[PDB]
Structure 1
Amino acid sequence: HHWGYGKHNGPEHWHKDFPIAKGERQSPVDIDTHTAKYDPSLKPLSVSYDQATSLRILNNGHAFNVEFDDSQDKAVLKGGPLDGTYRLIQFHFHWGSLDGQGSEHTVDKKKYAAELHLVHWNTKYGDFGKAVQQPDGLAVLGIFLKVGSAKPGLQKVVDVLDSIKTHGKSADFTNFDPRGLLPESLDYWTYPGSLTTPPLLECVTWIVLKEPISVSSEQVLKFRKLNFNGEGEPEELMVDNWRPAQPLKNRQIKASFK
């Protein structure tokens, strides 16, 4: 793809190829915690990941995705602001060149070191490619990472990064349990938004958890060793693969808690 995160092809250029970049329900956004409305009608999230089947990890030239088998209801998200059952298809992260930036959402303008996105699609639409064309097609769970103590459940991911260093590399990646990436509390903010990379489609109910998880400096350092480029091309380190906050426009952020 021509788009990327550099000076000449980065997010401030994306609108020329993807005019929806300047749409009414783009993501990410800044979550202003004092303007977010507590909504007592929001249910707890229901995360059922006990039967998750991970398959593969892949460097796609803009992040790395861990991909899951989504041919049956094995790892699903329900409840919260959702109607219906959303199946987990992949997760990936966005991170920075330094620990003070890297997240896409911000909370009262505070940036975190990285942000994990667990991407799920509405099973009523039959496949992911049909789901992205619907306003309620995707639900993405967003979790912030701060740098502090190591997260043991992330280490299996960081160990394999060496084997997918360049764009197009993939590796078998089975028996990874994504329950090891969740914080203790499932309290959340939610708003209607978009994919944060091209094609930027406005098909996402965002569910952003309040509680960050901690990872160690050494764990995030290993993300920063990946490359945007393919093998045998000039080295460009995969860092700062985040899109800046977009205008909220005519949207309300709701909170599941006070």
Structure 2
Amino acid sequence: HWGYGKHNGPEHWHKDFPIAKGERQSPVDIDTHTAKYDPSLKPLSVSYDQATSLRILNNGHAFNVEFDDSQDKAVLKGGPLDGTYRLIQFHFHWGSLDGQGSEHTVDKKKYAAELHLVHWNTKYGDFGKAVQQPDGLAVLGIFLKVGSAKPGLQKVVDVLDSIKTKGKSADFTNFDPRGLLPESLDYWTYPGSLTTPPLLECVTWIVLKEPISVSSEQVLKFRKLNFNGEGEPEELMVDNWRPAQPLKNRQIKASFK
């Protein structure tokens, strides 16, 4: 099935998922000189105080930290969003070397990694119904650069040993996603898609301008994860990022002047 290797990677996805060549695909290059400040944007409200993490799963592509979304506990609202969007999970994309790993790029600049916090529109009742709607999802994207350690990430880093291979999960309750955010909520926004198959075009993308810094040893531990399942030959989980896709006359708006 789909992956990130020569034979099952981004160049192959369109065959099972035709939308791969659609009109609102993600990620994209953010050309800072073409993006326009949008005064009609409301302030962004990230409300992760009551967040109820459940567990962490190696899904054979990345790792997912999952949340209880049966109530309005951790929500994204404001900005380009109408209504309330519930946090369902987060995951990362990263590279084999520090000069690559992010999905979105900024004036062609690739970061070492990128964090995605995934939310669904509560008017649709559940995630599965939301992914049938043009405004069903919102994903908050955050760039990672190598420098000082990120304290709020270490609990995640700590547990990676326990989920080395595809299909492994560990209890991951009481994790606070507020520790993964940069200081500024300045962002670019555009309408886009999931960056993995099924590549559904139901996402409002909100990409933060300010990267977080993570340590060399923190990213190294990401790169020790496996794509393969237990007892299979070792394929290091690295370079699990889709490259930038055609903007196609979409408008990237900036929240900042």
Instruction: Please indicate the TM-score interval, normalised by the length of the shorter structure.
Output: over 0.9
Distance in 1 of aligned mates of 2:179 and 2:7: 38
CA distance in 1, matches of 2:40, 2:13: 37
Kindly provide the CA deviation profile for residues 96-121 of structure 1, in whole angstroms up to 9, marking residues without a partner as x. Answer: 00000000000000000000000000
RMSD of equivalent CA atoms: 0.5
Please identify runs of 4+ aligned residues in structure 1 that moved more than 3 A.
none
1:152 Cα deviation from its structure 2 partner: 0.6
Shift of 1:161: 0.1
- How far, CA to CA, are the matches of 2:238 and 2:27 in structure 1? 18
Gaps of 5+ in 2: none
- Matched residue of 1:83: which SS? strand
Aligned-partner Cα distance in 2 for 1:138–1:130? 10
Kindly state the Cα deviation for residue 162 of structure 1 after the two structures are TM-superposed.
0.2
Identify unmatched segments of 5+ residues in structure 1: none
Q: Tell me the residue number matched to 2:110.
A: 111
TM-score normalised over the length of structure 2:
0.99
C-alpha distance in structure 2 between counterparts of 1:130 and 1:82, whole Å: 18
Aligned to 1:161: 160
| 3-state SS of paired residue (2:82) | coil
Q: Report how far residue 179 of structure 1 moved.
A: 0.4
Q: Give the deviation of 1:41 after TM superposition.
A: 1.3
How far does the alpha carbon of each residue in 1:127-178 deviate from its partner, in whole angstroms, 9 at most, with x for none?
Answer: 0011011000000000000000001110000000000000000000011100
Q: CA deviation at 1:84?
A: 0.4
CA–CA distance in 2 between the matches of 1:49 and 1:15? 35
* Residue 239 (structure 1) shift: 0.3
C-alpha separation in 2, matches of 1:257 and 1:88: 24
Count of residue pairs brought into register by the alignment: 257
- CA deviation digits over 1:42-86, x for unaligned, max 9? 111101111000000000000000000000000000000000000
Task: State the alpha-carbon separation in 2 of the partners of residues 152 and 228 from structure 1.
Answer: 26
User: 2:56 maps to what in 1?
Assistant: 57
**1:193 alignment counterpart:** 192
Q: Using the alignment, how far apart are the partners of 1:248 and 1:157 within structure 2?
A: 33
Instruction: Return the offset for 1:252.
Output: 0.4
TM-score (ref. length: structure 1): 0.99
Structure 1 residue 34, shift from structure 2 partner: 0.4
Identity %, equivalent residues: 100
Name whichever of 105-114 and 37-46 sits farther off. Answer: 37-46
Secondary structure, counterpart of 1:120 in structure 2: strand
Q: CA deviation at 1:40?
A: 1.0
